[PDB]
Amino acid sequence: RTIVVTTILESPYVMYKKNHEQLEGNERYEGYCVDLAYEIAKHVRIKYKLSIVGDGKYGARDPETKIWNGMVGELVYGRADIAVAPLTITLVREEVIDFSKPFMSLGISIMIKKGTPIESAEDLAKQTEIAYGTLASGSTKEFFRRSKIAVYEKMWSYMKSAEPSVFTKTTADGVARVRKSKGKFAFLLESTMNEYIEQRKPCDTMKVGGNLDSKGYGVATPKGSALGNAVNLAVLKLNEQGLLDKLKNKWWYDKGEC
Amino acid sequence: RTIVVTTILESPYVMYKKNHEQLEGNERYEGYCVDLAYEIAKHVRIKYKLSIVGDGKYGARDPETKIWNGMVGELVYGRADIAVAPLTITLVREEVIDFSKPFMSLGISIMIKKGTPIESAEDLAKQTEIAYGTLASGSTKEFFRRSKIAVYEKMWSYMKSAEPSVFTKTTADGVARVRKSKGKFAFLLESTMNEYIEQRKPCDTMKVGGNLDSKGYGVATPKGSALGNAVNLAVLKLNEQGLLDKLKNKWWYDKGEC
Numbered sequence: 001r002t003i004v005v006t007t008i009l010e011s012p013y014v015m016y017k018k019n020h021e022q023l024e025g026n027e028r029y030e031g032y033c034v035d036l037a038y039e040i041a042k043h044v045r046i047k048y049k050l051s052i053v054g055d056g057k058y059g060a061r062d063p064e065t066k067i068w069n070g071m072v073g074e075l076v077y078g079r080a081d082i083a084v085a086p087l088t089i090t091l092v093r094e095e096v097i098d099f100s101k102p103f104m105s106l107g108i109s110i111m112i113k114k115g116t117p118i119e120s121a122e123d124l125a126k127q128t129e130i131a132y133g134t135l136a137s138g139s140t141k142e143f144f145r146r147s148k149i150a151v152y153e154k155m156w157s158y159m160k161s162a163e164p165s166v167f168t169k170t171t172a173d174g175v176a177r178v179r180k181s182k183g184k185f186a187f188l189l190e191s192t193m194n195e196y197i198e199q200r201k202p203c204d205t206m207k208v209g210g211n212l213d214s215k216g217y218g219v220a221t222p223k224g225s226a227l228g229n230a231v232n233l234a235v236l237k238l239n240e241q242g243l244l245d246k247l248k249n250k251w252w253y254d255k256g257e258c
Numbered sequence: 259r260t261i262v263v264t265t266i267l268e269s270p271y272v273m274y275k276k277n278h279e280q281l282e283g284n285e286r287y288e289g290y291c292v293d294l295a296y297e298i299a300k301h302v303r304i305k306y307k308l309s310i311v312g313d314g315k316y317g318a319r320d321p322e323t324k325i326w327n328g329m330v331g332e333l334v335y336g337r338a339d340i341a342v343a344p345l346t347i348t349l350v351r352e353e354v355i356d357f358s359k360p361f362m363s364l365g366i367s368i369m370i371k372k373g374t375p376i377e378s379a380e381d382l383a384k385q386t387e388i389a390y391g392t393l394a395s396g397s398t399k400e401f402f403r404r405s406k407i408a409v410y411e412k413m414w415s416y417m418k419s420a421e422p423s424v425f426t427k428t429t430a431d432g433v434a435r436v437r438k439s440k441g442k443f444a445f446l447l448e449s450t451m452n453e454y455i456e457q458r459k460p461c462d463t464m465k466v467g468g469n470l471d472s473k474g475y476g477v478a479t480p481k482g483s484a485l486g487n488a489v490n491l492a493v494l495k496l497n498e499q500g501l502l503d504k505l506k507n508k509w510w511y512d513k514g515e516c
């Protein structure tokens with residue numbers, strides 16, 4: 001009766017509340033996806049427990065082992081009933097899980113330390129002074145790996161062979177690396193995360209240039225799950241009511257710091 | 259064996275080629291959705307015939323008669339197998355037809371004649387000198403009708419009661435009305451159409467302010483159609499390959515005039 005909602009600690013989607021160590025269950029967490037899960041469960045009429053994905057990954061398939069990890073794996077192997085997270089709708093995932101229509105639109109983007117002389121991916125690719133990387137095990141990395149577009153192929157060739165690694169285990173690690181690198185590291189990550197960090201102290205980063213692609217996050221459910229239809233209608237309803245907009249403003253901009 | 263693809267004459271999605279009167283079948287037409295249909299049919303492996311929707315409507319349900327019109331109706335009553343058009347994914351449509359993940363992201367937007375002293379929906383709502391309207395029978399009208407947000411309720415109250423009508427039968431009619439009204443008419447329409455017209459002679463219109471919402475166009479198929487899954491994967495593939503981007507540039511910007 002209580003459905004398991006897998007998610008991921010990623011600001012400002014899911015974050016520990018100030019005094020989380022004193023709290024239990026869903027009360028431990030707050031953020032955009034916490035509010036979204038709440039609103040969805042209200043419309044779908046279900047009780048639910050939030051579960052931070054053990055491996056802290058979004059979801060990729062190991063090419064030799066064929067096993068899916070991350071939140072995707074939790075749905076594929078039946079350990080979670082739904083994923084409410086900034087989980088990018090991609091072809092390879094759509095082949096193994098279902099997704100609602102997007103609750104958020106976004107694109108890959110470039111984060112720089114303010115003052116870094118970079119305005120575009122083309123700028124990054126043609127030089128080697130400033131290092132650059134992506135999150136490991138996610139859709140941004142796969143974008144570069146899979147691209148057949150010259151600029152992105154070049155970037156991927158550089159990143160894949162870079163030493164030390166330019167692939168971070170979390171978004172937060174990549175941001176920290178941008179902040180501490182005195183302008184010699186730039187981070188490729190989704191515009192949503194980039195825009196959020198731009199609004200937080202110490203206000204030393206910025207998104208530059210246009211997004212590299214155009215895509216969406218969806219609420220995910222096991223292939224053929226009978227929760228799928230209701231979750232999809234719920235997302236559409238929440239969008240048309242203006243609630244998704246309200247939540248984005250709430251967690252990104254209303255308390256912006258920059 | 260030959261599937262019927264319903265669509266709509268809407269620039270630059272589907273347009274008559276220069277010498278269409280001399281041509282037959284699919285060759286009569288060109289545009290973004292013509293190219294998209296082609297690419298999709300290639301991936302799904304089907305032969306197809308484009309069919310301009312007889313009533314020239316997107317799709318709404320008559321509240322008394324309960325009948326769906328437009329492209330939606332063509333799918334609901336089994337007269338078309340697929341819709342490849344700028345057809346907005348909405349809750350009420352999702353209840354009766356299926357949609358692919360979005361092939362284009364967009365939002366409601368304001369078109370003005372250059373120089374019109376309007377920058378936002380708030381600007382429109384608080385005054386009566388400049389008239390404003392939407393397409394009849396589409397998702398933009400429904401947005402206003404359905405909103406519970408003060409500014410939009412006010413706008414809807416004004417539009418619903420305005421005399422003469424501010425509701426146009428086509429996008430093209432609303433644009434023409436903006437162009438001929440010396441700044442005394444503004445048109446509410448999707449950002450995609452607005453951005454296209456901004457790039458066409460006589461370059462006398464512009465999009466102003468932010469979009470009012472955030473949504474998408476999907477390729478549509480009858481509820482439970484066995485074409486649905488392949489069409490959805492096809493759209494995702496075309497997006498991830500950069501083809502959708504390439505087509506948007508092709509039909510909007512590559513030959514921009516302004």
Ligand SMILES: N[C@@H](Cn1oc(=O)[nH]c1=O)C(=O)O
Nearest residue numbers: 058087088138139140189190
């Ligand atoms: N939403 C992404 C995870 N990730 O977040 C970023 O900012 N880049 C990236 O790959 C996914 O679902 O894989």
Ligand SMILES: N[C@@H](Cn1oc(=O)[nH]c1=O)C(=O)O
Nearest residue numbers: 316345346396397398447448
């Ligand atoms: N895509 C819209 C049709 N329409 O185009 C606009 O620009 N506004 C509007 O309502 C629909 O599917 O109803």
Ligand SMILES: [Zn+2]
Nearest residue numbers: 016018020021
């Ligand atoms: Zn803590």
Ligand SMILES: [Zn+2]
Nearest residue numbers: 274276278279
């Ligand atoms: Zn003609």
